[PDB]
Amino acid sequence: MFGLIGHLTSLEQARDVSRRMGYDEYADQGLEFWSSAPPQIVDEITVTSATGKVIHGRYIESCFLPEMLAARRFKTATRKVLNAMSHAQKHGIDISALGGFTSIIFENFDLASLRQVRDTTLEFERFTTGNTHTAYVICRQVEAAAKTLGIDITQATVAVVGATGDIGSAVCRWLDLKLGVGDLILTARNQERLDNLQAELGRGKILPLEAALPEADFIVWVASMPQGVVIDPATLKQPCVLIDGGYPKNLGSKVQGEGIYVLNGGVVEHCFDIDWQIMSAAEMARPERQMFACFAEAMLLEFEGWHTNFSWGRNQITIEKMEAIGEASVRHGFQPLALAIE
Amino acid sequence: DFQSESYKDAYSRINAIVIEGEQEAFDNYNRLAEMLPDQRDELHKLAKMEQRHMKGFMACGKNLSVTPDMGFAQKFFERLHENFKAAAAEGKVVTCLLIQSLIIECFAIAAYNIYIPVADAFARKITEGVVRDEYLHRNFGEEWLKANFDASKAELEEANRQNLPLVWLMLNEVADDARELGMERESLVEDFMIAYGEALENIGFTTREIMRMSAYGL
Ligand SMILES: NC(=O)C1=CN([C@@H]2O[C@H](COP(=O)(O)OP(=O)(O)OC[C@H]3O[C@@H](n4cnc5c(N)ncnc54)[C@H](OP(=O)(O)O)[C@@H]3O)[C@@H](O)[C@H]2O)C=CC1
Ligand SMILES: *C(=O)CCCCCCCCCCCCCCCCC
Ligand SMILES: CCCCCCCCCCCCCCCCO
Ligand SMILES: [Fe+2]
Ligand SMILES: [Fe+2]
């Protein structure tokens, strides 16, 4: 049994999604109701691999909302994640993805030292961040977008926003040693981690966000922004490929203009329909087929019987792990989401 | 964390509520005996477990400088008391079980879970013991109603609607005093809903049913 621990993007989405699927009482309430809401299994999932293996899974709504972070409800956000992980364990789920900010909260608030959750002691090998698959998928998306638009990635500049992040650092490593990107712009807030990533790679210029974007042929957005920022197309090169892998989306507006290409980063499409309606809520282009790469990692671990915390912690993702999950991703029928044209 | 002055004042009626609550469950479990013949023996053992918790929580007030307000606590529980009194006097056992083994137990699980990390060390050791017993008491209601689910479902739904709103009212009355003992109301609701939801699930309600029932009155 795999699990998908997720959350919604905003209170407004929480109302709509709760307004659907019945739930009239859950969909008129404000932040304080979600701050005390319990985790729930709200969907049962069956997936068939290209190999023909059938697996089963469960979607768990953690009830975390990004507004909790901006409202400084740090202990609320901490409880949403611990309660959700305890809930997965009590239901006997073997491997669960910590979607979106649930893994970011886990790391940033040292939830590992709080593994004692009421009755339960959390077993970390039953969880994955899903970030190894996400970074692999985003790297394949850079590669494919470059080829689709006739851009030579070996002579292009790629800015990684959230470069020192768990996903970002992995993207950097792969864009460096597997794709051979021309120039790497490392963009992060904390200077020490930026210095350390630059040293680790042996390349890369560190630039604050406002100076990085005008230099970039590709911008990979993998920042832990609760909200998302408004980038004016006039600030960007032509062409510029924006791969927004954030959840919530790092781009707080529809960035469009001549020579601007936007792609939902870290999304895969499966060769078979999946029966469910969470990805419908999740605003995929084809929600029956498409999903976040972190959720797909839990399916992959379950397809392979790798019942372990395959992606865990921060800055620990390697190229070899990305290759292993990538090979499995292809074999079980997943493909990176590509640019839409026409 | 100076546990003197208003802490004892707040503690004066929080401690009262826990005493009277442990009393109410003692009575309620003895009358549930009178109500379910082939199971008096088990219900008397659980009723006795309540006795012991009640004495343990007198000690915590005697460890601090606190004499509890038994009158405020009897007023706290009178709505739940009257509802249990009246369902008993009508033979409505399913309603009696929901009130005692589901609502009241989950109220205790939530209350004690939130208490343990911010108690005085003496009160913490005591609370640590009682919480495990409350989980098996809730299990009594669960198995009974689980085995008699189809027969009891409609009345469980009705008794939830009539009684669960009282939990919110009580958790708001007692909200201010709970906070000064280091207990956020928001955490109490959450632990209550977690404990209550899991019991309704084991009894056989679906997630949609649980999410409708668990938020009633909120
Ligand atoms: N399948 C998918 O599509 C997935 C999507 N995601 C999404 O992508 C994001 C990244 O995930 P993850 O790596 O786990 O999170 P991390 O916290 O590991 O990554 C965030 C990093 O980006 C930097 N950063 C954060 N906010 C800002 C900002 N406002 N401006 C500039 N830099 C910033 C931080 O650097 P510093 O340390 O210097 O502050 C931090 O190291 C998440 O928010 C998540 O929603 C994540 C995983 C999978
Ligand atoms: C990967 O790390 C990103 C994961 C995103 C987090 C999950 C978002 C998709 C799930 C939302 C779809 C429907 C949720 C239903 C909520 C029910 C509320 C009562
Ligand atoms: C000792 C912790 C006090 C917590 C205060 C929270 C509000 C009052 C809760 C009272 C619950 C008493 C339940 C007793 C029944 C046990 O079977
Ligand atoms: Fe008790
Ligand atoms: Fe009890």
Author numbering:
A (entry chain A): 1 to 342
B (entry chain B): 11 to 228
Lines quoted from the article behind this entry:
In order to identify the NADPH binding pattern, we either co-crystallized AAR or soaked the AAR–ADO crystals with NADPH, and finally solved the AARNADPH–ADO structure at 2.1 Å resolution by soaking the AARthioester–ADO crystal with NADPH. In the structure, one NADP(H) molecule is accommodated in the hydrophilic cleft above C294, and is mainly stabilized by the mid-domain of AAR. The ADP moiety is sandwiched by the dinucleotide recognition loop and the 222VASM225 loop region within Fr-III. In the AARNADPH–ADO structure, the nicotinamide moiety of NADPH is located close to C294 of AAR, with its C4 atom being located only 3.14 Å away from the stearoyl-C1 atom. The short distance supports the possibility that C4 of NADPH provides a hydride to break the thioester bond. The stearic chain is located in the acyl-tunnel of AAR, as was observed in the AARthioester–ADO structure. However, the weaker electron density of the stearic chain in the AARNADPH–ADO structure suggests that it only partially occupies the acyl-tunnel. Subsequently, NADPH is incorporated into the cleft above C294 of AAR (S3, represented by the AARNADPH–ADO structure), before AAR catalyzes the hydride transfer of NADPH, and before reduction of the acyl moiety to a long-chain aldehyde.
The earlier discovery of the pathway responsible for alkane biosynthesis in cyanobacteria allowed the conversion from solar energy to alkanes through photosynthesis, without providing external carbon sources. Subsequently, ADO catalyzes the conversion of fatty aldehyde into alk(a/e)ne with one carbon shorter (Cn-1 hydrocarbon) and the formate as a C1-derived form. Here we report the crystal structure of AAR from Synechococcus elongatus PCC 7942 (SeAAR) in its apo form (AARapo), together with three structures of AAR in complex with ADO from the same species of cyanobacteria (SeADO), in which AAR binds either substrate or substrate/cofactor.
